[PDB]
Every structure is written in structure tokens, then in C-alpha cells.
């Protein structure tokens, strides 16, 4: 009946002065916009149908046309930024917010879905959805004694839309909007559905991707132990954002970093640093690099958890991006560590894989490794053991690599390599 209509027939039906003809034509548009291969979104926009669909959202007396027009508009809003703008320009934001209070669950859900797509476009539309007052009615849909009574798909859509209101920077979401959403987000983080847990973790990862004041708002809510629990989940869609959030928190203050260590996060790192997914190994090594950038007692916890051999591991063999993060973890450790901690790093076999990476065609990793070598030599100077280290670097072919770097195109590499040869290899 409403399958494979032309755009011309949809326009004729919607322009009729007959509500049932308009309903049939709107359903036909929804089905056209729902097809898997190339839905004619631009053709529907060019036919001037977005203002008609938006007016149909307000037809309280005809719930089927509210649903069909909400679905058609959600399909358009899910497209390119230009296509999402066409929906916003048609006045859809207040019309969708008014539908959040619909007594029909399938209509309310469609409005949740549409607002998530609009807010997900970027910072400006996210902030515009917030200004039109979407947060209060969205949170009211989750104000139930137990989240388990809500329909699974409905709860997943609400969580995803809330995550989009937490997403994007320049600027980050309004502080009061973040404070308003955070108690519901904390509750969703303790739910048992994997998709709700993944999107709640993504929301937390967005909120912690910023200055220390942004991280503090989250950490103050006591979510760090729950994030560490999810970091240990078997589902990769949960581990990925839980690791991102933990990684973001340790970019903060020493005290925020300490909350991560106190919650037992380091006990998961033997598996994360050997994870078969390269992005997990890479972001886990980045997280380690920010912990080794901490206090001497925090570097000591890395040592106590047996993680230095795991850092030697990723430096020895891993995807290059992970090896670069491992080089940063070592340079940070050698910058802030005690002589005893630096001695321990050498005893774990850091020298040979650190020297092997001086052959890489990446100036940034060369700079980071040369800084680590200088830091280790400074520790050896305090013990009068510079000769033992010089021979160690010589034996694994490290001297040949540092000598060749004296004629490198980069100024900082040239200077640092000439300095090491003149100070310890002459």
C-alpha cells in the first residue's frame, strides 16, 4: 500500500486536504527514507516536506501521523550535517521536545532518537537542544525506581541520546547541563545491559576529556571504582570506552590519578597491555604513560603491580603507535623516578628495545628515546656506573644508532645525540 511511492505521489498526498491521505503519504515517505540503499533524503528535503512533517508532530488528535512524521524526520536528521540542519531549520527541536511527554511509548522513543541525532551533530546543535529544555523531560523518562522495568530498546535510546548531550568540545557542554545529567549517568553506569553500559561509559569518556575541573565533576561522583569494574568486562564495546574514561582521568591531577590506582585499575593492565585489539594496547600504554608521569609513589605502584616487564614487552613488539606510547611511558618514568626505580627499569631489560627503536622514521619517537637515555645516564652518574651503561648500549648496537643520529635533519635530535657521544662515548 505505502511501499515504493514516488516523491511526487508523497507530495500529492501530503498536500491533500485529507488527514488520512496525509497519513498514508507520510508513512510512504517514512518507508522510502527507511530503505537500506540510497534513501532519497535530499529529494524529500527539496520537495519542501520537512515543514509539513514538523506540523504533523503537533497533531495530538492523530498519534499515527505523529509517529510516521517523527520517524521520517529522524531518518533525515540521521544524515549529513546539512540534512540535520534542514530538520532543525524546519522547527523540529521544540516539536520533538513536546513529544517526549507523549502517552505513546513508540512516539516518545522516536522523539528521544531524533533529539540524539540533532544533538550529535556538534556543539552548536547540542547546546541548542539544551536551550530548548530537552534535559528535564529526558531525565523524567528515567525517573523510575528500577531501570529494569523500562523496555530494553527504549532505555538504550535514552542512554545514547544523553551520551550525545555529553559529547563534543569547543565548547564542552554547559557546566550546569553536565551537573544535571551526571546523577542519571551514574545510575546508568550500574545497569546490567551491555549497550547501556557501553554508551554510559562513552558519555563519561566525553565528560572527562578536558581540563582538571571537568574531570573533578565526574571523579567527585564516585564512579572511578565502577569504571575499573567495567575496564575488566569481557565485552570489547564496554572495555573500549571504560579504558578511554580511565585514560582521560589520569591526564588530570596527581589526586585524580591516585583515585584510579586506589580503585585497583593497575591489576587489569597485564591483560590490557597484551590485548589482541591494537587500539586497546595503544590506549592502555597511553594510560600507563600518564601514570608514569605521576609521583614517585605512583611510579612505585606500577613497579609493585609487575607492570615494568609489560612495558618492556610493548616497547619490544607492538604496533608502532603503541611502541611510541611505550617510549613516552619510559621517558616519563625516567623523568620522575628515583635512582632505584630507574635501576630496576634497566634490570628489566629496557635498554635493548629502547635502542632498537632509534631506527624508526619518526622524529618524535627519536626525541623521546634520547631524553630517556639522558635520564638513565643521569641516574648512572649518581651511582658512578656510566661505563656499565655505555658498554650495555654499545653491545646491543645502540652506539651505532646514536652516532648516525648526529647527522639527522632535526636540530633537537642532532644536539641530544652529539651530547651523549661527547659525554659518555669518548
Amino acid at each position: 500500500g505505502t511501499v515504493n511511492w514516488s516523491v511526487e505521489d508523497i507530495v500529492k498526498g501530503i498536500n491533500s486536504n485529507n488527514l488520512e491521505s496525509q497519513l498514508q503519504a507520510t508513512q510512504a515517505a517514512r518507508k522510502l527514507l527507511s530503505r537500506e540503499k540510497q534513501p532519497p533524503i535530499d529529494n524529500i528535503i527539496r520537495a519542501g516536506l520537512i515543514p509539513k512533517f514538523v506540523s504533523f508532530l503537533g497533531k495530538t488528535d492523530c498519534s499515527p501521523i505523529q509517529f510516521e512524521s517523527a520517524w521520517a524526520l529522524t531518518n533525515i536528521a540521521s544524515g549529513t550535517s546539512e540534512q540535520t540542519k534542514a530538520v532543525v531549520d524546519g522547527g523540529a527541536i521544540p516539536a520533538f521536545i513536546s513529544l517526549l511527554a507523549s502517552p505513546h511509548a513508540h512516539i516518545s522513543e522516536q522523539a528521544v532518537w531524533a533529539l540524539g541525532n540533532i544533538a550529535g551533530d556538534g556543539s552548536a546543535f547540542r547546546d541548542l537542544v539544551i536551550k530548548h529544555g530537552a534535559i528535564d523531560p529526558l531525565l523524567a523518562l528515567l525517573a523510575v525506581p528500577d531501570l529494569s522495568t523500562l523496555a530494553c530498546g527504549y532505555l538504550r535510546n535514552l542512554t545514547w541520546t544523553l551520551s550525545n548531550l555529553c559529547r563534543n568540545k569547543n565548547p564542552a557542554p554547559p557546566l550546569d547541563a553536565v551537573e544535571q545529567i551526571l546523577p542519571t549517568l551514574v545510575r546508568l553506569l550500574h545497569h546490567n545491559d551491555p549497550e547501556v553500559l557501553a554508551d554510559s561509559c562513552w558519555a563519561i569518556s566525553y565528560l572527562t576529556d578536558g581540563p582538571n575541573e571537568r574531570i573533578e565533576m565526574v571523579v567527585k561522583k564516585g564512579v572511578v571504582p565502577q569504571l575499573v569494574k567495567l575496564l575488566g568486562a569481557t565485552e570489547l564495546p564496554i572495555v573500549t570506552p571504560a579504558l578511554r574514561a580511565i585514560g582521560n582521568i589520569v591526564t588530570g591531577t596527581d589526586e585524580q590519578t591516585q583515585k584510579v590506582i586506589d580503585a585497583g585499575a593497575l591489576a587489569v593492565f597485564p591483560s590490557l597491555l597484551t590485548n589482541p585489539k591494537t587500539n586497546i594496547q595503544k590506549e592502555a600504554t597511553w594510560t600507563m604513560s600518564n601514570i608514569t608521569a605521576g609521583r614517585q609513589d605512583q611510579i612505585q605502584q606500577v613497579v609493585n603491580h609487575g607492570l615494568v616487564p609489560f612495558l618492556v614487552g610493548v616497547l619490544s613488539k607492538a604496533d608502532f603507535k603503541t611502541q611510541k606510547e611505550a617510549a613516552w611511558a619510559i621517558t616519563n618514568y625516567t623523568s620522575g623516578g628515583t635512582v632505584e626505580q630507574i635501576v630496576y627499569l634497566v634490570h628489566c631489560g629496557i635498554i635493548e628495545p629502547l635502542m632498537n627503536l632509534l631506527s624508526a622514521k619518526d622524529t618524535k619517537i627519536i626525541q623521546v628515546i634520547l631524553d630517556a637515555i639522558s635520564n638513565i645516564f643521569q641516574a648512572a652518574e649518581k651511582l658512578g656506573e656510566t661505563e656499565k651503561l655505555s658498554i650495555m648500549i654499545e653491545e646491543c648496537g645502540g652506539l651505532d644508532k646514536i652516532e648516525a643520529l648526529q647527522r639527522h635533519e632535526n636540530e633537537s635530535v642532532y644536539k641530544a645525540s652529539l651530547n651523549l657521544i661527547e659525554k659518555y662515548f669518548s
Binding site: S34, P39, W71, N75, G79, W113, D121
Partner: peptide, 6 residues
């Protein structure tokens, strides 16, 4: 992110 209803 954005998601269509198929």
C-alpha cells in the same frame, strides 16, 4: 554520532 531507524 548519528543513527538511522531502518
Amino acid at each position: 554520532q548519528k543513527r538511522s531507524f531502518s
